[PDB]
C-alpha cells in the first residue's frame, strides 16, 4: 500500500514522538547550559517558515495544503530527536562524562539536521520541492549544511539505500556548485585564511575549509579516475591533469565562482592532454563524461563566461580558461599526489 520509502520512514518513526526522550532530556540536563528550549525554538521557527513557503505559491512551485505539511513536519521532528540522541550518546564527550553544552549550542547543526530530516521526509514522498528548496526557504548555507549528511548516514542505519543514495546526491550537488556560488559562505572562509586554498596533500594526508576541500578533492579524484579509464590515458597524464586541476583551485579559485566543478576538471583534462603527446578532443571527452551520473548537458553547453552572458565549454576554455592556465600547462610542452 505504502511506497518502499514511505513505509521505511514509518518504521523508523514508529513508537517515537516529536519530543526529546527521557534519555535525551537526561543528557540535556547533564549540560551546565541545558539546550532544550533553544532546540524547541529552532524547531518552532523552522516549522513556521516551512509551512508558510509550503502554503504559498511561486511561479515555479505551486503551494499545497496545511495538513500535509504539518504531517510532513511532525515526522521530520520525530527523526530529528532520534538522530540527535544517536549523535549525542555516540559522542566521545558522553563516553568520557564531559559537559556537552558547547556541542549542543551550535544552532547551525540543529537547523541543518532538521532540514536534512525534512528532505528525507519530502523525497520519501517524491515531493515536487526538489533540493535546494528546504535550505533555500530555511536560509541555510550549502557550505554549512553538507556537513550533517555524513552525520545522518552514520546515525540512522534504518535509512534505506535509496535514501542514502539521495543524501550522497545532494552532498555532491553542494560540493559541485551550490557551495561555489558568489554568495556562498565558502568565500568568507577563504577570506579569513588570507585566501589561501588548501592543497590536496594538506587535507588528504578540523577546518571548515579543510573538510570542504578534502571532500571536493575526493569527489574530483573519483570523477577523474573514471574519465581516465574510459579514454585510456596514462596514469602519469592523470597525475598531470590532476595537478592542473589543483592549480586552478588554489591559484585560480575565482574560476569556480558561480560555476560547476566538472567544468574546470574537463578543461584541466583537455589542456594537459593537448600539452602532451596524448591529445584527446573535447568531443572524445564529453562522449565518456556523458555516461557519468552528474553529467547533464548544461555542464558543457551552458558555462558561465562573464557577468550576465553564458556560452559553452569550448568557448569558456578559449575566452577565459586558457589565458589563466596556459603558464602552468606550458611547463610540460612538480606533480601533486593523486589519492583513493
Amino acid at each position: 500500500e505504502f511506497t518502499q520509502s514511505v513505509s521505511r520512514l514509518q518504521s523508523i518513526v514508529a513508537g517515537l514522538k516529536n519530543a526529546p526522550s527521557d534519555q535525551l532530556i537526561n543528557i540535556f540536563e547533564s549540560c551546565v547550559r541545558n539546550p532544550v528550549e533553544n532546540i524547541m525554538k529552532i524547531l518552532k521557527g523552522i516549522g513556521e517558515t516551512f509551512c508558510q513557503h509550503y502554503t504559498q505559491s511561486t511561479d515555479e512551485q505551486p503551494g499545497s495544503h496545511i495538513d500535509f505539511a504539518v504531517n510532513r513536519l511532525k515526522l521530520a521532528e520525530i527523526l530529528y530527536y532520534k538522530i540527535l540522541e544517536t549523535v549525542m550518546v555516540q559522542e566521545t564527550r558522553r563516553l568520557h562524562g564531559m559537559d556537552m553544552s558547547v556541542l549542543l549550542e551550535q544552532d547551525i547543526f540543529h537547523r541543518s539536521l532538521m532540514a536534512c530530516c525534512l528532505e528525507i521526509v519530502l523525497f520519501a514522498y517524491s515531493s515536487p520541492r526538489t533540493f535546494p528548496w528546504i535550505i533555500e526557504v530555511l536560509n541555510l548555507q550549502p557550505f554549512y549544511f553538507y556537513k550533517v549528511i555524513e552525520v545522518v548516514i552514520r546515525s540512522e542505519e534504518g535509512l534505506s539505500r535509496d535514501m542514502v543514495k539521495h543524501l550522497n546526491s545532494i552532498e555532491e550537488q553542494i560540493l559541485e556548485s551550490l557551495a561555489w556560488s558568489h554568495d556562498s559562505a565558502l568565500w568568507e572562509a577563504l577570506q579569513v585564511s588570507a585566501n589561501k586554498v588548501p592543497t590536496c596533500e594538506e587535507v588528504i594526508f578540523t577546518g571548515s575549509l579543510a573538510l570542504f576541500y578534502r571532500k571536493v578533492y575526493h569527489l574530483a579524484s573519483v570523477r577523474l579516475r573514471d574519465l581516465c579509464l574510459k579514454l585510456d590515458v596514462s596514469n602519469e597524464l592523470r597525475r598531470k591533469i590532476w595537478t592542473c586541476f589543483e592549480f586552478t583551485l588554489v591559484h585560480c579559485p575565482d574560476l569556480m565562482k558561480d560555476r560547476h566543478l566538472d567544468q574546470l576538471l574537463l578543461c584541466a583534462f583537455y589542456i594537459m592532454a593537448k600539452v602532451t603527446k596524448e591529445e584527446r578532443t573535447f568531443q572524445e571527452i564529453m562522449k565518456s563524461y556523458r555516461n557519468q551520473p552528474q553529467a547533464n548537458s548544461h555542464v558543457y553547453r551552458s558555462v558561465l563566461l562573464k557577468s550576465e552572458e553564458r556560452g559553452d565549454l569550448i568557448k569558456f576554455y578559449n575566452t577565459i580558461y586558457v589565458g589563466r592556465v596556459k603558464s602552468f600547462a606550458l611547463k610540460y610542452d612538480p606533480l601533486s599526489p593523486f589519492p583513493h
Binding site: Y270, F282, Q283, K287, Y300, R301, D312, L313, I314, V322
Partner: peptide, 11 residues
Amino acid sequence: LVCHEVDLDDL
C-alpha cells in the same frame, strides 16, 4: 593551446 573545435554537438 587553443581548441579549434566549433561545437560539441557530435556526441
